[PDB]
Amino acid sequence: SSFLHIGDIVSLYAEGSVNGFISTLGLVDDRCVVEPAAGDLDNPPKKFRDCLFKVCPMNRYSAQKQYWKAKQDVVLLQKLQHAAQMEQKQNDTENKKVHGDVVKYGSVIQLLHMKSNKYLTVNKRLPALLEKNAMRVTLDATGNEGSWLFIQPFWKLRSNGDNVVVGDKVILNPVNAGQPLHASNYELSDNAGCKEVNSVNCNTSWKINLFMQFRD
Amino acid sequence: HLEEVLKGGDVVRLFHAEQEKFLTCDEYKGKLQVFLRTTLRQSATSATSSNALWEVEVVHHDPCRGGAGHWNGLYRFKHLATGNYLAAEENPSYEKIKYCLVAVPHGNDIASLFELDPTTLQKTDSFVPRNSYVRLRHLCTNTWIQSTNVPIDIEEERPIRLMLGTCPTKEDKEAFAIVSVPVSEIRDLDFANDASSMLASAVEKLNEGFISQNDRRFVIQLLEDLVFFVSDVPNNGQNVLDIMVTKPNRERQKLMREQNILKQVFGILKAPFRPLVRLEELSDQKNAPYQHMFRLCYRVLRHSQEDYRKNQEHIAKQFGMMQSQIGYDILAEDTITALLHNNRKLLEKHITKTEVETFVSLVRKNREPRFLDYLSDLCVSNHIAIPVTQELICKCVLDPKNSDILIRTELRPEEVWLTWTDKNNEHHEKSVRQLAQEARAGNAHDENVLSYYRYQLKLFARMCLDRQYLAIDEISQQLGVDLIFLCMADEMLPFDLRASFCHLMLHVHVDRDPQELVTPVKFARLWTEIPTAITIKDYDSNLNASRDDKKNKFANTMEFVEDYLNNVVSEAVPFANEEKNKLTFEVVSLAHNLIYFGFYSFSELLRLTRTLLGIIDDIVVMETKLKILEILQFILNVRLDYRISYLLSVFKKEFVEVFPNLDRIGEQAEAMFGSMLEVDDEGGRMFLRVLIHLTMHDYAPLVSGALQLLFKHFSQRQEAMHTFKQVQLLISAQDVENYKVIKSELDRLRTMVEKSELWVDSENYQIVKGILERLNKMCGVGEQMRKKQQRLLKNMDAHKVMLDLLQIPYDKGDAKMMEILRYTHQFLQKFCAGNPGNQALLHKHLHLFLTPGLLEAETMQHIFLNNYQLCSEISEPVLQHFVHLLATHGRHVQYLDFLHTVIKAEGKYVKKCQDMIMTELTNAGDDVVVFYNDKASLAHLLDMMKAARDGVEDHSPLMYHISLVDLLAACAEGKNVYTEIKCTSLLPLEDVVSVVTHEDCITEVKMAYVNFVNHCYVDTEVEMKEIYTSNHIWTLFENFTLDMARVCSKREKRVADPTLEKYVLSVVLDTINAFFSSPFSENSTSLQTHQTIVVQLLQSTTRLLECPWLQQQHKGSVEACIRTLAMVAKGRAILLPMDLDAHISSMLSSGASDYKNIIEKLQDIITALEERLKPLVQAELSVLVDVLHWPELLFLEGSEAYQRCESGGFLSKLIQHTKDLMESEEKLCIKVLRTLQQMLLKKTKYGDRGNQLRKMLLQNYLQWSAIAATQCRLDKEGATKLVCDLITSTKNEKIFQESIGLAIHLLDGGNTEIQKSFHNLMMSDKKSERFFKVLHDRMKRAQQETKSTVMGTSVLIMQPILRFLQLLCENHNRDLQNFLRCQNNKTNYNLVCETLQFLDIMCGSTTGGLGLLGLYINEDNVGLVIQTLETLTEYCQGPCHENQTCIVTHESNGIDIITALILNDISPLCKYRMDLVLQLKDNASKLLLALMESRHDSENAERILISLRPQELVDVIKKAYLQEEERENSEVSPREVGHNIYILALQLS
Ligand SMILES: O=P(O)(O)O[C@@H]1[C@H](O)[C@H](O)[C@@H](OP(=O)(O)O)[C@H](OP(=O)(O)O)[C@H]1O
């Protein structure tokens, strides 16, 4: 028994309509999928590196978003770029300083997929490819405000402000979209046996399995 | 023995959180079973039961030793209420459960051993803290416990018992919380168990047949102990058989019910009569102890059911035996009455003709007044008459057969004689005076006769209650008005008898027809009926003439009431004798009823007011005080009406004199506002003193009434003007005729409704239908007179009559009743048509229309139609009810129409309503949101459209679908992204095009789909816009061109279709313009097919413009569409035809190149009077401030009231009651808060007349250091706690704003005493968490709204909060400065960081601070920015190193914004209001200086210099010094700002 610390490498096991780990398609694809037939908790999938995520603290993207909006006047753009770089440095320093802190229920976190080195993001302005009634979950290198995720309890024996214990089932609720991640039953045409991950109200829960710690 | 750990022998509850249920062990069928009990209570943790208590036993080697528990130890659980031990046994079936939990009798086996498993990381296996979640494992089988949904009591309604089971696999969510149990409950359970065991033994002995004397005495003692325990009253030697309880113990009642004690009581009452004792032998002294035992049992039953529905029903389940044991001296009828007097359901279910006849026979046999009292009580429940029981009792008692049980009365030559019949069938007659005299002497027979007569009168009055004509008609002849008047006027008769006579008079004669409530103020008056001169006598004569009755049959009654009140006030102490208090209350109630029915005159009302004030200066006393206050309010309303009549008479006199002035009319109006209209003879001193004394009472209704009257006393002028502004004259002859017709019809309809019961189940229906039709016709058509008719109806109060008619009871199936109801609904809808006042009046009674029904839905739609005020404030429950009706009853278009009307009103859309409706529709499912997307559904839709080709029925599935599509389009038209996404998913574009392009498609569906596409695809925030880069839109444009060609052909052939014309001229052009006026469409026009479609659109649109049939209204839209399309085509470089291009160029060049007089005079008079009297209104309102500041001067020195007022009791009581009335009277709370703010505010002046009025009123009534003293006094009284509680517990924006303002006024001047009081309250009280949380939430909401805008209530209310914080931290209060940053509580909110983030967001963030600061600081937010800067400066100063460091190193980089505020010029605002810019610069400089006061390190200096470039700083300093033109008439000189900036530069250098 141990608590969840910022910087730990963890795996998420969906236990809802479809049971399986969170995986990402190879190449430069930015789609998160769940493959129930790949493996389970007792028999993890052979390729047990695409399902590993790292917990990171909240980051500030106001200056970066403003710079992107301006880019999409030369002096203003250059100063916005400088401000964005300074904000990135400040975020890196804050991550280094907050490294090793315990994660509490109701707190905002980010999930960095290590193999692709990309933050998991949810876009509230883009419907999902298959389930048109759900929003789109993807992976972004730089990241945006959609990477924020409230780590909410799933069981009633856990309350806000309590430390997260390894092995618990939790809910990852995007701050902006406001609808928990859902492992839909839709199957991708391109890849067989894989199920989509989107953002829509459901009863899905994610079990947190510890793989490595920050001190290790 | 620590109390913070789990110890052996402790009693706890095991609460399964996942199921949210307690673990219980109960006997279901002759066997104990363990389970989880399901509760319907909202709070699952409040479902505490005595059977859920478990005892924890720690297992050690020594059986006599316990000790604190350990996580690694073994535990046993014993059922404290039964003694059984929890254990597990083999599953009989073996589902997933292998073993099922049970309750074994002995706990010496290993099957009852359990061990705990913590759910988290504990501090080693040292101790088990209480109130900690645990998991239970069965050691013997090594299995973990879990819950299941299998009901044990499956073969019953409402299963509540759920089986648990142990499985070999552990579940983490299956955890139990340990809840502590009070020692009071533990002791109560122990006592109940012991009593139940003893009663069971006694019942067993009684059933056996032989009971010893000692056993019987022990049983009697146990019953007495149970009675005392249930009553919860100390045993001080009072008789057990007669105990009065002020507050029943619900916990003890529930324990008695659930421990099977009432069952034992019933067994005791039932066993003897099966024979040890017979009901016919209970009078024997030998069987007297059994009688006492039965009486004790019945007392226990009565005490176990007081104010407890469940216990009442449980006892009523055995009603047969309780009724079979009636009559004998056991007190069974008393229990029966106590049962069926508070529960209406059981009363009507049980009390019937058989019971009434049994009571009648019993009273015939015995003639005990108690039976008549019980009969009277059975007629009324909760002070409300029950028609069924009332009619039954009346028809049984007044039956001529049972005429020997009632005492008859007669008048002889007069004097009153009473005649009765004794049990020996002997007739007796005697005079009332002789009876009373002999009773006073001591004659027991006469006293009993008088008591019997009094109870008979009480029964008659209760039967006649609520206008029971069946009994009133029979009793009136027997007891006339003259007889009752003589009896009540007689003094020798006892006060109780006089009070009974008064009550009978009130409930027999006064409460009848045609007597009805009369409105003191009438808004409609006839010009011909306004006398030139009006006085009190003339007004009284006019009221008498208006009254229908010519001869008053209650004049003697009123005279007697006046004489009695005069006698009462003559005595020094009015409320001394309790017996006389009953008579006084009855007289006051009779006077109140007569006044409200309109039998008094103005002079009589004034005399009664003086008498009642003299009387004024315990429940009966409070009730009579409330009655007196109501009478006073009615008389004040009458006085206001008289003043209005006087003003009307003055206006008429002036108008007639000048047309066969303003100063004269104003002086005449001022004259009455002082002599003869005064409430009292002391010029209001007595009235004010009485109001204050009543406010000083602890009775909440009396305090509220006194406060309301006190507030209304100092607003006579304002209220008079407000009422005079709503006066209608009805000068025209047509208006007079309509007024007469409306009056007659309303009177007839109201009489018919009042006499409803005789025709609801006949010409009455025809009369009602004719009246309704005539009223509907009279309402009129045409806005020219529709407003006049609606105002006349509002003044005549037809809406109340219509609401009463709607509320009339009826039975389903009556077509005529349905028709009249429909007519009433139509009348209400027409009445609420374009009149916001009428709409609000109807909405005030909304609860009536919250029932299923198409008529009700239409009425709601009409009420909410085109009313933004109500549409924006519509409540969530209404929408939830409408959605539930749609889901359950069916799919009806009325609900969709109501939803659309709520969404759109007065053009502007309601974002809240849109979002709420969309969310509700999404959550409802597919049963209300039906779309035809599949092949079969599309075929069905095509078939329906083909069938509806000629037209669409008003109620049809096609109409419902169209309404749903329109509603979704309206919802998506707002500013929500998920709504648009959901709409697109529900209706894919492919389905839209397939439906539209189909040859068989109605124009309504086409228009709905086109509007849906326009509002959900063309205009959206979705980054991936599917409308573009697709051929669906091009196909839709081709269909639009085909439709245009069809319209042109039809117009040429004279087959014009208005629907098609409206569609093409409304939605097609709008969609085309929206599509072609967007940047994303630039790449769309690329392909050759797209170019050809563009050319087709060009030719079609130019042909449409050329065709002359188009109206002038759409010419602008057509021209705009043509210009946009031509611009797009030219940008795309399309080879247009030569003639078409020439015509387009030509079009572009062309485009580029005496009742009226009476009303007017009345309006002018109203305006002049208001303008002249406003200062006097202000002065009169202000006088209340001094009255509340010095309330003790009204009383006389040396009195108890004077001492209480001087000691600040008045203000303390007002403050304490303000919190109590906050929930009830929000308006009164707001008024009290405003009064406190005015009292805390500085004194001012109004003018010569205002000062004269103020000084005169002060003389008549009351025969910065000051502000600080007043603030300290209010703080001592408890204003700070009041404002804190209001802020932390209120939901009303007005209340929150008033609390903030009062706090600001208290903290004004930086009062250290109030600051310390606030700090102490915050640090001590546990509500500081809530206070800071709500402040943080409000600030975050304001920040979010500001960000979205980059105005509004949230943004505006920020400034008061910032001012409050600034005053809180004023004078360098380091304690509060640090507390606002960090709190010692568990959760801390950083208000400094929140304020800095708000400032950064409002200043434009990085883009604003990099040089675009001028585009965000407008003329409205400049004050808020200045206040924020001042608050930040106050935080920084003191100095506060922590706050300075936090602001400097905050992640939001607000220091850059602060520096930009100095180094940048707000160009838009500099050339308009330069002083505000100078103030902003000065505040920024002061904040920067405060950020570095007590700092020796260079961190802050370097951080500031990073943004402050020295060259720019010097340049701005020099510019400020040079600037001198603005100094002209400037509050702040630029030179001072430049000097401050120079000082900052020196410090930074
Ligand atoms: O407010 P009311 O009308 O009295 O109704 C109460 C409550 O709503 C439930 O009916 C019942 O709780 P359960 O669902 O737990 O039976 C309770 O009984 P209780 O006194 O046994 O709690 C009642 O008193």
CSV table of C-alpha atoms in Angstrom, one decimal, chain B residues 908-1092:
chain,number,residue,atom,x,y,z
B,908,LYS,CA,-33.3,38.4,-26.7
B,909,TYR,CA,-32.4,34.7,-26.0
B,910,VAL,CA,-32.0,33.3,-22.5
B,911,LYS,CA,-28.7,31.4,-22.2
B,912,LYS,CA,-29.7,29.8,-18.9
B,913,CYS,CA,-33.0,28.5,-20.2
B,914,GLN,CA,-31.4,27.3,-23.4
B,915,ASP,CA,-28.7,25.4,-21.6
B,916,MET,CA,-31.0,23.9,-19.0
B,917,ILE,CA,-33.6,22.8,-21.6
B,918,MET,CA,-30.9,21.3,-23.8
B,919,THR,CA,-29.4,19.4,-20.9
B,920,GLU,CA,-32.8,18.1,-19.8
B,921,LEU,CA,-33.6,16.9,-23.3
B,922,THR,CA,-30.3,15.2,-23.6
B,923,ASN,CA,-30.7,13.4,-20.2
B,924,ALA,CA,-34.3,12.4,-20.9
B,925,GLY,CA,-33.4,10.0,-23.7
B,926,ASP,CA,-34.9,9.0,-27.0
B,927,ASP,CA,-38.5,8.8,-25.6
B,928,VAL,CA,-39.0,12.6,-26.1
B,929,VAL,CA,-36.2,13.3,-28.6
B,930,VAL,CA,-37.3,11.2,-31.7
B,931,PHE,CA,-35.5,11.5,-35.0
B,932,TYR,CA,-36.0,9.7,-38.2
B,933,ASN,CA,-32.6,8.6,-39.4
B,934,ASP,CA,-32.9,4.9,-40.1
B,935,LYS,CA,-34.3,3.7,-43.4
B,936,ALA,CA,-37.6,2.6,-41.8
B,937,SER,CA,-38.0,5.8,-39.9
B,938,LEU,CA,-37.2,7.9,-43.0
B,939,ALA,CA,-39.8,5.9,-44.9
B,940,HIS,CA,-42.4,6.6,-42.2
B,941,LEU,CA,-41.5,10.3,-42.2
B,942,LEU,CA,-41.9,10.4,-46.0
B,943,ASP,CA,-45.3,8.7,-45.7
B,944,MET,CA,-46.4,11.2,-43.0
B,945,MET,CA,-45.3,14.2,-45.1
B,946,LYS,CA,-47.1,12.8,-48.2
B,947,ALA,CA,-50.2,12.4,-46.1
B,948,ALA,CA,-49.9,15.9,-44.8
B,949,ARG,CA,-49.2,17.3,-48.3
B,950,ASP,CA,-52.4,19.4,-48.2
B,951,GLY,CA,-51.7,20.5,-44.7
B,952,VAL,CA,-50.4,19.6,-41.2
B,953,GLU,CA,-52.8,19.0,-38.3
B,954,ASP,CA,-52.3,21.1,-35.2
B,955,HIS,CA,-51.7,18.0,-33.1
B,956,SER,CA,-49.6,15.5,-35.1
B,957,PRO,CA,-46.3,13.6,-34.9
B,958,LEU,CA,-45.0,15.7,-37.8
B,959,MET,CA,-45.9,18.9,-35.9
B,960,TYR,CA,-44.2,17.5,-32.8
B,961,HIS,CA,-41.1,16.7,-34.8
B,962,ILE,CA,-41.0,20.2,-36.4
B,963,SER,CA,-41.4,21.8,-33.0
B,964,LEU,CA,-38.6,19.7,-31.6
B,965,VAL,CA,-36.3,20.6,-34.5
B,966,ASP,CA,-37.1,24.3,-34.0
B,967,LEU,CA,-36.5,24.0,-30.3
B,968,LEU,CA,-33.1,22.4,-30.9
B,969,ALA,CA,-32.2,25.0,-33.4
B,970,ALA,CA,-33.1,27.8,-30.9
B,971,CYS,CA,-31.0,26.1,-28.2
B,972,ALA,CA,-28.0,25.7,-30.6
B,973,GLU,CA,-28.4,29.4,-31.6
B,974,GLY,CA,-26.8,30.4,-28.3
B,975,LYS,CA,-23.2,30.3,-27.2
B,976,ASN,CA,-22.6,26.7,-26.3
B,977,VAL,CA,-20.4,24.2,-28.1
B,978,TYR,CA,-21.5,20.9,-26.7
B,979,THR,CA,-25.1,21.8,-27.6
B,980,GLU,CA,-24.1,22.3,-31.2
B,981,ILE,CA,-22.2,19.0,-31.1
B,982,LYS,CA,-25.2,17.2,-29.7
B,983,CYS,CA,-27.5,18.7,-32.3
B,984,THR,CA,-25.2,17.7,-35.1
B,985,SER,CA,-24.9,14.2,-33.8
B,986,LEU,CA,-28.7,13.9,-33.4
B,987,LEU,CA,-29.3,15.3,-36.9
B,988,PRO,CA,-26.5,14.4,-39.3
B,989,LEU,CA,-26.2,16.6,-42.4
B,990,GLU,CA,-26.6,13.5,-44.7
B,991,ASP,CA,-30.1,12.9,-43.2
B,992,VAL,CA,-30.9,16.6,-43.6
B,993,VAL,CA,-30.0,16.6,-47.3
B,994,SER,CA,-31.8,13.3,-47.9
B,995,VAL,CA,-35.0,14.6,-46.3
B,996,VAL,CA,-34.8,18.0,-48.0
B,997,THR,CA,-34.0,16.8,-51.6
B,998,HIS,CA,-36.8,14.2,-51.5
B,999,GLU,CA,-39.6,15.2,-53.9
B,1000,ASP,CA,-42.2,14.5,-51.2
B,1001,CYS,CA,-41.2,17.0,-48.5
B,1002,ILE,CA,-43.5,19.6,-46.9
B,1003,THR,CA,-42.3,23.2,-46.9
B,1004,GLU,CA,-42.6,23.4,-43.1
B,1005,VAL,CA,-40.1,20.5,-42.7
B,1006,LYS,CA,-37.9,22.1,-45.4
B,1007,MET,CA,-37.8,25.4,-43.5
B,1008,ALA,CA,-37.2,23.7,-40.2
B,1009,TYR,CA,-34.3,21.7,-41.5
B,1010,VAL,CA,-32.8,24.7,-43.3
B,1011,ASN,CA,-33.0,26.8,-40.1
B,1012,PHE,CA,-31.4,23.9,-38.1
B,1013,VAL,CA,-28.5,23.7,-40.6
B,1014,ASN,CA,-28.1,27.5,-40.5
B,1015,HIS,CA,-28.0,27.7,-36.7
B,1016,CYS,CA,-26.1,24.4,-36.1
B,1017,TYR,CA,-23.6,24.1,-39.0
B,1018,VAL,CA,-23.0,27.4,-40.7
B,1019,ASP,CA,-22.5,29.4,-37.4
B,1020,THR,CA,-20.6,27.3,-34.8
B,1021,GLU,CA,-17.5,27.4,-32.7
B,1022,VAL,CA,-16.5,23.9,-33.8
B,1023,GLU,CA,-13.0,24.0,-35.3
B,1024,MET,CA,-13.8,21.1,-37.7
B,1025,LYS,CA,-16.7,22.6,-39.7
B,1026,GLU,CA,-18.2,19.9,-41.8
B,1027,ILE,CA,-20.5,22.2,-43.7
B,1028,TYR,CA,-17.6,23.4,-45.8
B,1029,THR,CA,-15.4,21.1,-47.9
B,1030,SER,CA,-18.5,19.0,-48.8
B,1031,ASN,CA,-21.0,18.6,-51.5
B,1032,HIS,CA,-24.0,18.5,-49.2
B,1033,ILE,CA,-24.2,22.3,-49.0
B,1034,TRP,CA,-23.9,22.5,-52.8
B,1035,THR,CA,-26.8,20.0,-53.2
B,1036,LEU,CA,-28.8,22.1,-50.8
B,1037,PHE,CA,-28.1,25.2,-52.8
B,1038,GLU,CA,-29.2,23.4,-55.9
B,1039,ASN,CA,-32.5,22.5,-54.1
B,1040,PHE,CA,-32.8,26.2,-53.1
B,1041,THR,CA,-32.5,27.3,-56.7
B,1042,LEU,CA,-35.1,24.7,-57.7
B,1043,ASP,CA,-37.4,26.1,-55.0
B,1044,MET,CA,-36.8,29.6,-56.3
B,1045,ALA,CA,-37.7,28.6,-59.8
B,1046,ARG,CA,-40.8,26.9,-58.6
B,1047,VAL,CA,-41.8,30.0,-56.6
B,1048,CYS,CA,-41.3,32.2,-59.7
B,1049,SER,CA,-43.3,29.8,-61.9
B,1050,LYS,CA,-46.2,29.7,-59.3
B,1051,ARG,CA,-46.2,33.5,-59.2
B,1052,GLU,CA,-46.3,33.7,-63.0
B,1053,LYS,CA,-49.2,31.2,-63.0
B,1054,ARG,CA,-51.0,32.9,-60.2
B,1055,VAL,CA,-50.5,29.9,-57.9
B,1056,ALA,CA,-48.5,31.9,-55.3
B,1057,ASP,CA,-47.8,29.8,-52.1
B,1058,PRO,CA,-47.4,32.0,-49.0
B,1059,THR,CA,-45.6,29.2,-47.1
B,1060,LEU,CA,-43.0,28.7,-49.9
B,1061,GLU,CA,-42.6,32.5,-50.3
B,1062,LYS,CA,-42.0,32.9,-46.6
B,1063,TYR,CA,-39.5,30.0,-46.6
B,1064,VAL,CA,-37.5,31.3,-49.6
B,1065,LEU,CA,-37.5,34.9,-48.4
B,1066,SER,CA,-36.6,34.0,-44.8
B,1067,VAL,CA,-34.3,31.0,-44.5
B,1068,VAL,CA,-32.8,30.4,-48.0
B,1069,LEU,CA,-31.4,33.9,-48.3
B,1070,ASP,CA,-30.2,34.0,-44.7
B,1071,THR,CA,-28.4,30.6,-45.2
B,1072,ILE,CA,-26.8,31.7,-48.4
B,1073,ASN,CA,-25.6,35.0,-46.9
B,1074,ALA,CA,-24.2,33.3,-43.8
B,1075,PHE,CA,-22.4,30.7,-46.0
B,1076,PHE,CA,-20.9,33.2,-48.4
B,1077,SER,CA,-20.0,35.9,-45.8
B,1078,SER,CA,-17.5,33.8,-43.9
B,1079,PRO,CA,-13.7,33.4,-44.4
B,1080,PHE,CA,-13.9,29.6,-44.4
B,1081,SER,CA,-16.0,29.7,-47.6
B,1082,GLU,CA,-13.1,31.2,-49.7
B,1083,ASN,CA,-11.8,27.8,-50.6
B,1084,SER,CA,-15.2,26.3,-51.2
B,1085,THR,CA,-15.7,28.1,-54.5
B,1086,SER,CA,-13.0,26.2,-56.4
B,1087,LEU,CA,-14.5,23.5,-58.6
B,1088,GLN,CA,-16.2,23.9,-61.9
B,1089,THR,CA,-19.4,22.5,-60.6
B,1090,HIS,CA,-19.2,25.0,-57.7
B,1091,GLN,CA,-18.7,27.8,-60.1
B,1092,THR,CA,-21.7,26.7,-62.2
